[PDB]
Design a protein around this ligand. Structure first.
Ligand SMILES: NC(=O)c1ccc[n+]([C@@H]2O[C@H](COP(=O)([O-])OP(=O)(O)OC[C@H]3O[C@@H](n4cnc5c(N)ncnc54)[C@H](OP(=O)(O)O)[C@@H]3O)[C@@H](O)[C@H]2O)c1
Ligand SMILES: NC(=O)c1ccc[n+]([C@@H]2O[C@H](COP(=O)([O-])OP(=O)(O)OC[C@H]3O[C@@H](n4cnc5c(N)ncnc54)[C@H](OP(=O)(O)O)[C@@H]3O)[C@@H](O)[C@H]2O)c1
Ligand SMILES: CC[C@@H]1C[C@@H]2C[C@H]3/C=C\C=C\C(=O)NCCC[C@@H]4NC(=O)/C(=C(O)/C=C/C=C/[C@H](O)[C@H]3[C@@H]2[C@H]1C)C4=O
Ligand SMILES: CC[C@@H]1C[C@@H]2C[C@H]3/C=C\C=C\C(=O)NCCC[C@@H]4NC(=O)/C(=C(O)/C=C/C=C/[C@H](O)[C@H]3[C@@H]2[C@H]1C)C4=O
Lengths: 354, 354
């Protein structure tokens, strides 16, 4: 049969800490075989996600392999028993590649720290998307990030009116969704941000107080900032940061509090591996801490409820989901790099349209 | 009108770390005014509990005050509007005193780390007791520690046939109670213990493996023993120790695992305040970690349930609830000292008959 020319970003070099996109990634030209097994598909990439958790995926990617990532793909061609037909849109972990072949079946992440299984590709139905909630939201508020926020806030956390909710890593999409939902449930909402503009932006989304984690560098400076922003204690904590801000929150946990652990940026990215033992602080509060791994909620029923509940709020404008769509496959690493800059222009989910 | 000489153990000196019980405490004769107020009672102590959690209570007890502890008392005299009548048997936080005047209402622990409120005295009634459930069980299987184990197993942990339940600090009444209920639900149960002789005691109670925590110094050695003792990973963990055993367990948590935090001996007594950050290990397992503070279960309906459910199994000797009752009020601090220094001989709940 035949082949096609494709471009891929591949992992050139492993560097821990804050990644250097120009140094770690290299754009190569690749020839793709277009011969399809009975259930395989030939896919074109329309949109690609960039996310912080790619820092850890990258370090587990064999050198030379392509950078994995969440993406939106269109089926160009398909074998006879492929799950989707040409023209069908799917969301899945297609990676930083213009084109690819895959059967869309669940695949195990072999070289990762845990036995993680990337989900089967998911069919996208155009009826769910419009100008208010466009197709690219399948990578954001109607995707992984939305599912993480919405699943946590309806399957685990039980915000009550009058509660104080703290959200670390609040300026990103998952943080802002959690805060806005908490607000709807009647809570005082405290966030952390890196800039006066980002802090003002969270105040526009309805955060009642925002702490600057660059001035508050230590649990001490942090404890004081929290005690001011949350004088009555903390009832819920949505944690994407860990490290010293989380150490400070655990000193002021109220009774029956709940902590959702979504990420530990300060450990994973900043390599903060040791610190004060936190478990001694949860007994009298009777606090509940749940690890979040939102892949467990990727079910057809959860996707429908996501669209009904969360999609309605976004559409009625009762809940704001911003995205920064950068254009051009060649600018994927540059767009990924801004997740770690000091630029305040990073509103919501960062995306690349290809 | 009248008075009455009594003896009390008072806190002479504050000593951090492992208690030196003969240096910390001092036995004093105290004349008690027995002119009761309207809601007040005069009570006589029949038994006292000694517990590792008394180490922190003591540290928070101002010099010269009496040492608090759980006790079984008997109402000698009672004012008109007293909540109990002479001859009534009650359980409450009477402390290391031979006699005392209290109104038995709930009381705020004004000097503690946290805002703890000691419960109101609860009446005992002799009919529920016999030689299989002696009256002294209101300080163990039918008291605080029984409420701690049964409440964790029926209100938090959901042990299912085939689980591997790990229990740190398993020789005492709470740890052994957890293991036996877990075995009754179908689990493999792993404990820790300090003596070869208690290891064989736990096994004969149903434990499928017992680590020597004294032999396994650090996290590493403890992972090796746990890898051996629980090869399918940990599904439930009942923690009373924290420190390096708990660090080990968190490296091998299964998906959906439940951790219950009962105490942190390593931090409270051994002063180990820093360690590896544990929250990074719980996201992929979706672990749930709940702090235990069984005072929230001290409810009339919950006591009834504890009798019904545990009373039967205990009397039949299905579920084994041992006690070690020392004799003599002057021996209370030495009995308490054994929990830290000479526990090799103890079996279940250490109490002291006065
Ligand atoms: N467990 C799961 O299932 C799961 C699922 C999806 C995602 N995640 C993770 O959860 C996180 C949430 O997603 P997101 O879209 O909301 O990411 P994100 O927060 O946008 O990631 C980068 C942001 O974090 C902030 N940040 C960086 N260092 C910080 C620090 N030391 N303290 C506080 N904030 C800091 C920055 O905000 P400023 O610009 O204001 O500094 C920046 O905008 C992501 O990191 C992702 O990897 C977990
Ligand atoms: N959270 C709550 O609401 C609550 C309520 C009640 C009690 N608690 C606490 O829960 C624990 C259990 O109660 P219990 O009555 O069964 O007391 P216990 O376990 O008998 O307490 C002392 C025993 O723990 C063992 N131990 C000492 N150091 C250890 C270590 N590093 N690792 C493992 N075991 C060690 C010793 O047993 P060996 O003889 O085997 O060395 C000792 O006899 C205690 O810490 C108690 O204060 C908490
Ligand atoms: C096709 C759909 C897409 C598939 C994608 C799979 C996950 C991506 C990355 C997972 C990484 C991971 O599991 N360990 C890396 C080890 C370090 C660290 N330790 C963690 O426990 C952890 C995390 O829990 C991350 C969680 C991230 C959740 C995402 O939503 C989904 C992506 C999802 C939208 C960490 O990053
Ligand atoms: C009349 C009935 C009786 C009343 C008694 C009160 C508690 C005793 C001690 C509580 C201490 C306390 O809370 N802070 C000290 C702080 C350090 C440490 N940090 C904790 O979180 C913690 C603990 O949670 C203890 C939990 C203990 C549970 C007991 O069964 C009940 C006793 C109970 C049987 C600690 O010891």
């Amino acid at each position: 049969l035949g082949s096609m020319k494709t471009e891929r970003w591949v992992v050139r070099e492993h560097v821990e800490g804050v990644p250097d996109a120009a140094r770690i990634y290299e754009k190569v030209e690749t020839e793709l075989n277009t011969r399809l097994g009975e259930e395989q598909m030939l896919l074109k990439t329309l949109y690609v996600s960039v996310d912080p958790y790619l820092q850890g995926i990258c370090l587990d990617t064999p050198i030379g392999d392509h950078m994995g990532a969440d993406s939106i793909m269109q089926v160009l061609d398909a074998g006879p028993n492929a799950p989707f037909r040409p023209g069908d849109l799917v969301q899945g972990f297609g990676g930083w590649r213009t084109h690819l072949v895959s059967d869309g079946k669940p695949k195990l992440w072999q070289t990762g720290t845990f036995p993680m299984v990337f989900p089967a590709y998911r069919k996208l139905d155009l009826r769910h998307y419009d100008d208010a909630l466009p197709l690219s939201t399948a990578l954001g508020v109607m995707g992984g990030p939305g599912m993480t926020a919405w699943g946590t806030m309806t399957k685990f956390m039980q915000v009550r009116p009058g509660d104080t909710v703290v959200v670390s890593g609040a300026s990103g999409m998952i943080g802002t969704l959690v805060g806005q939902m908490a607000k709807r449930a009647g809570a005082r909402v405290v966030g952390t941000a890196g800039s006066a503009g980002k802090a003002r932006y969270l105040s526009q989304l309805g955060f009642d107080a925002v702490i600057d984690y660059k001035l508050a560098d230590d649990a001490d400076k942090m404890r004081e900032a929290l005690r001011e922003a949350a004088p009555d204690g903390v009832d819920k904590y949505f944690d994407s940061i860990g490290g010293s801000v989380t150490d400070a929150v655990f000193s002021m946990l109220n009774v029956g509090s709940q902590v959702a652990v979504c990420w530990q940026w300060a450990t994973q990215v900043q390599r903060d591996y040791h610190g004060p033992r936190l478990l001694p602080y949860i007994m009298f509060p009777r606090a509940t801490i749940r690890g979040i791994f939102s892949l467990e909620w990727f079910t057809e029923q959860n996707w429908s409820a996501l669209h009904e509940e969360l999609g309605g709020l976004v559409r009625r404008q009762e809940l704001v989901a911003h995205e920064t769509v950068q254009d051009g496959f060649e600018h994927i690493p540059a767009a990924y790099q801004t997740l770690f800059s000091a630029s305040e222009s990073n509103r919501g989910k960062v995306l690349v349209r290809v």
